[PDB]
Design a protein around this nucleic acid. Sequence first.
RNA 1: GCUCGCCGGAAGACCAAGGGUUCCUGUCCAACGUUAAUCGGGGCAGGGUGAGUCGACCCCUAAGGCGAGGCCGAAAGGCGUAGUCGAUGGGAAACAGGUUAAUAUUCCUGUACUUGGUGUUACUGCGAAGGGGGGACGGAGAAGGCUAUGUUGGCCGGGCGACGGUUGUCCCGGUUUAAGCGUGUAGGCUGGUUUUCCAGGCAAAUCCGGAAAAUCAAGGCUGAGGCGUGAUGACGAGGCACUACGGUGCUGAAGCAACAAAUGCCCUGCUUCCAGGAAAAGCCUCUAAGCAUCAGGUAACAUCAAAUCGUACCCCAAACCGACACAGGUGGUCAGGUAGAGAAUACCAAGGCGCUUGAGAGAACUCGGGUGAAGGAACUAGGCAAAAUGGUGCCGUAACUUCGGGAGAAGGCACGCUGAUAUGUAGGUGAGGUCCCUCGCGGAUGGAGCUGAAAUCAGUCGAAGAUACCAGCUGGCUGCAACUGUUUAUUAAAAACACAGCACUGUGCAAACACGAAAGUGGACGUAUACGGUGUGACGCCUGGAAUGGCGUAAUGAUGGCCAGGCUGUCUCCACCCGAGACUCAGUGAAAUU
RNA 2: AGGACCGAACCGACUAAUGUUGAAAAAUUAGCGGAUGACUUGUGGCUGGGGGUGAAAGGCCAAUCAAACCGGGAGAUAGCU
Lengths: 204, 93, 46
Amino acid sequence: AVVKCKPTSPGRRHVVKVVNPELHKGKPFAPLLEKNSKKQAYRIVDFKRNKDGIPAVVERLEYDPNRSANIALVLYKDGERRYILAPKGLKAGDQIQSGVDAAIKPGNTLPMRNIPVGSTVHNVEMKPGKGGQLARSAGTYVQIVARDGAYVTLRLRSGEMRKVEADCRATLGEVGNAEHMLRVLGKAGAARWRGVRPTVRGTA
Amino acid sequence: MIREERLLKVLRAPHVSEKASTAMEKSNTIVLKVAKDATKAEIKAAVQKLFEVEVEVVNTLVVKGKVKRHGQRIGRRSDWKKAYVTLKEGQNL
Amino acid sequence: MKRTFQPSVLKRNRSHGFRARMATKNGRQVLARRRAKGRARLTVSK
RNA sequence: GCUCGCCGGAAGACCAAGGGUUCCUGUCCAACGUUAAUCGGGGCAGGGUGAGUCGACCCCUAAGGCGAGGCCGAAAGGCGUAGUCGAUGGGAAACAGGUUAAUAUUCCUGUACUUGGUGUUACUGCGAAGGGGGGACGGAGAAGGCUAUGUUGGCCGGGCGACGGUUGUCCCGGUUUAAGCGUGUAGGCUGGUUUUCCAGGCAAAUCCGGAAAAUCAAGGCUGAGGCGUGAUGACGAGGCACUACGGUGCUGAAGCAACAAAUGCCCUGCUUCCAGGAAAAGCCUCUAAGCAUCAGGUAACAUCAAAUCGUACCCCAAACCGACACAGGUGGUCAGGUAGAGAAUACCAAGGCGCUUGAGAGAACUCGGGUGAAGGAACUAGGCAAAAUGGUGCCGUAACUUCGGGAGAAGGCACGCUGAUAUGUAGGUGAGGUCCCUCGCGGAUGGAGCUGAAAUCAGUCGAAGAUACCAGCUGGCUGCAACUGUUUAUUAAAAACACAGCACUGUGCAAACACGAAAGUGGACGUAUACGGUGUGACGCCUGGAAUGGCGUAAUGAUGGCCAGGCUGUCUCCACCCGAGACUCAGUGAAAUU
RNA sequence: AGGACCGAACCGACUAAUGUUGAAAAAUUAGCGGAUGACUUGUGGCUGGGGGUGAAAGGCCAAUCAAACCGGGAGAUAGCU
């Protein structure tokens, strides 16, 4: 949710923040955090989703400082808590489950030989057993208009179609909120703690 | 431990001063100039076996030398460890 | 204001020390010309 | 030794880095101290730093270097594993009083805590290079309690005033008690107890977590502070005897309540926001093989051990860095009262000092200032400088605009002290009594006493009551630049530099590009809302002289200039006074140049 | 909430004066700027000279920088004094 501010002072004149008040406040799960030096913590997120057949219930939603997308904490039926990618249509207390069946709803993962034509699929695996690469940024969506043959065809966000082998996993549903483009940071000082330095002009 | 010849080279010379004279009556502590390393076991065993008196507690401090200017060349004095030997009850010379 | 020599014994021994000079191949040339000329104090003694 | 003055959120004190005996005593005056010096940070000789509880060392670890092996390369070397160094971090523990010419939480006395081992008694599922817990974290803001601390009152000890009064509602001093243990209150966190199972924690678990049942709602944990022990104590105002007159020995009364209140503890807490805010070791728990009369762990007592290293002294400076006993700089800690909102400003407490040259006359001239006949910018390139306003309450406050601002607009009245409401009011805090109960560090009434704003009326004194100091001049038009910001250390702080947003192209991961004989690496532990380059720079008219922006814009500015009220020795035009030099004298004592 | 306002410690030195064998091979005084964020600082490491770095002045790299210092070629060259 975005809220515009009243121009009490310039620079803090046009600052509009991109946040969600549904998320929590405080520290995340500390054993899944490391140093991640050059200061930001690194979340441990299962991109592969190798445990199949065991269901999971979503407890809460967290924010990620590394990526522009949001993650989610799942609860397996045997006492394991890990993180996955949070889609747009997630609610509190939803049952998600991986496996060869992977019923059609946003929040499951199945190999690309079983994707229905016309649905939005993100988090596409290319190399066998690596995963995680495509559609990590917010506001992206990839649709498939053709599945048949020895390779599936993907209409990527960049604007070109690419044929990928059908023995790789894929995540149903789409990415979350797309308001990350709408942040303009309002001032010069906002880009100072984000690591980017001012650019020296060549003709200066 | 003993190694009796090790304990004989710890004690260099007894030290006389106006502080040791008052410490002998008020605190019953004798001041002894000891060697460079001079561990607390060697000092307590050295006074315990050599002076044959019952040692209660041992203190040590390093005495830094000075710079003596006598002529063109510079000079320095030998460093020595001041040792405080406090006995149980009895006094000696 | 600030002067060009602010003292730091740890920075002086980490850079100009006897062991950092010995750990380099060209530092033994500095010690070679030093023992060739024959100064009393080489660099430092802790 | 007496008197005056300065600093006193320092010019005071313990300290860190650095210095290296500069610390203390006796003696000496050649040089050293800008003068003499009998003195000293100068010399001579002697002394002085006492650690299981202070720190360093040690265990582990970020940035980073080395990096046995190993990849590549003419040599050199580039890169890098398993490892290892590397505090700016974490990890064991002590306080009070006293003492010397110098050192103390280290020395004497009293009282605690911590680590490892041995012996005895008694009990026992012990056991990591493994797992879990915790260690373990950003910025801003608010409330309450308490302590150190200050005041009043009581009490104790000493006095009746060098000049009017002062046995009083008087004056002077004190009213300190620690660490630890027990109690677990203010406050915060979490729903507990029992039982069954488990694909996660590479195998395992009674442990962490998950999945099902019954009961109860207040149990469990962290945690400042108050009370008891500590303390039939020490310290203490003030005393008594022997004296090298320096001290020694001994004794020593009261040592409590209320109020205010810390930047200090509860609080690594609570609320809120997004930029989402190190790792590891010690410790507890759980088991795998094994050990299971053994060994290890657990409760108590006694004993042993806790080594080495620094401990003097300045440290917002005469001792460090500037060649100096130099008007510069240098980490953080302690932060009293009165007036004030304040660590600013003025005075004093403890403490440290009057800055290592002085004495005469009061001339010209130089500097810091003060006052001033009449005018008030006429002086100057230029209200530069100087002068002037400066604080609070009441009526009241314009042009413009992005509606936040301009604004404290300007402009009219009052400000001291004393009595009344009230022999001190609103508010805060709070004693004694009453009642109830687990019965306590407990709760409801209730006000003793203490502290204590703000306003009104009346009277009174001074020329002047924001009485001193500190402490915005005000209103209009206009160029550039949105703004806060950056630089030519040491002559230009601007229109030059930077700017969020915006416009264009390319890049599908073994990504573009850049770095390299190669290996390797950044981008990036990123994923087309992402990445590299280019031009412009909030915003409105808009982009057909019109984003190498045209025209303006509230606010902003060590930015250029004008006028208007007041103001002034800036000027007319200089006069007097307070200071430091310049004049003389005692002593030391150069240079530029020839 | 705040690169918001005034104003301390603190930081840079805009104006005016002084200083130029100075207290000082860049410092003081009085106004003036920021003053919770694009702030500052200690300690430790890295980036090295036809290079590093640079909110870009051709600034800085130990009181020196329109190519640091030391040693070497070198008693270079000089048509100059």
